Design a protein around this ligand. Structure first.
Ligand SMILES: [Zn+2]
Ligand SMILES: [Zn+2]
Length: 218
């Protein structure tokens, strides 16, 4: 019996959603994403693992008057993409990078309806920016920056205490990607990782350090 979907306010117009899946031999692992409010409209930054929790997430905001305008998935893994099928089935616009959709397609998974590429992509102009630091955790990992709040959603790229699942990781590239991310967003007030607690800009340095260490021992 998995823990309940959790939704709580982080800052003005920004909620953290947490969903849980059993994965071996980790036990139960929490996964954090965001919901970002733009007036009376809501954007999902990552989806929960399941249709059911995606539905609960969507319904929570819909029942409070917010129309769901879209979701963005930060990488191809199920902890960021598990709700894309559901959201597509409800005609809610989904977004992923062109590299993320290619990895989904290749793995037999339903793709985001919209895609983008490049270093920077504005999902919402001046409000929600998507940045591609380069390969790290996965080949396609992106991050999401909220310039008005100085909040960076780092997803599974930000790994301040250890790199985590290396299966699809580019250990050779991660230091350079982590270096670029740090230099881009050292101004961040809050950095929100996927599987640990919210922190400040130091998580960027800690991630770089973890990436460097991981490269050296391989
Ligand atoms: Zn992942
Ligand atoms: Zn993850």
């Amino acid at each position: 019996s998995l823990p309940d979907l959790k939704i709580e306010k982080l800052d003005e117009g920004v909620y953290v959603h947490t969903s849980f899946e059993e994965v071996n031999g980790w036990g139960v692992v929490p996964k954090h994403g965001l919901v970002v409010l733009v007036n009376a409209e809501a954007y999902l930054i990552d989806t929960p693992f399941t249709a059911k929790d995606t539905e609960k997430l969507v319904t929570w905001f819909v029942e409070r008057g917010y129309k769901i305008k879209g979701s963005i998935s930060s990488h191809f893994h199920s902890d960021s993409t598990g709700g894309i099928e559901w959201l597509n089935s409800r005609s809610i616009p989904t977004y992923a990078s062109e590299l993320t959709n290619e990895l989904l397609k290749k793995d037999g998974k339903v793709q985001a309806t919209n895609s983008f590429s490049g270093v920077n992509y504005w999902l919402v102009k001046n409000k929600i920016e998507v940045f591609y630091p380069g390969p790290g955790h996965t080949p396609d990992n992106v991050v999401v920056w909220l310039p008005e709040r100085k909040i960076l959603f780092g997803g599974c790229f930000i790994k301040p205490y250890g790199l985590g699942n290396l299966g699809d990781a580019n250990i050779e590239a991660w230091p350079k990607s982590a270096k670029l991310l740090k230099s881009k967003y050292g101004k961040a007030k809050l950095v929100v990782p996927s599987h640990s607690e919210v922190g400040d800009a130091s998580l960027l340095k800690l991630t770089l350090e973890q990436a460097v260490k991981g490269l050296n021992e391989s």
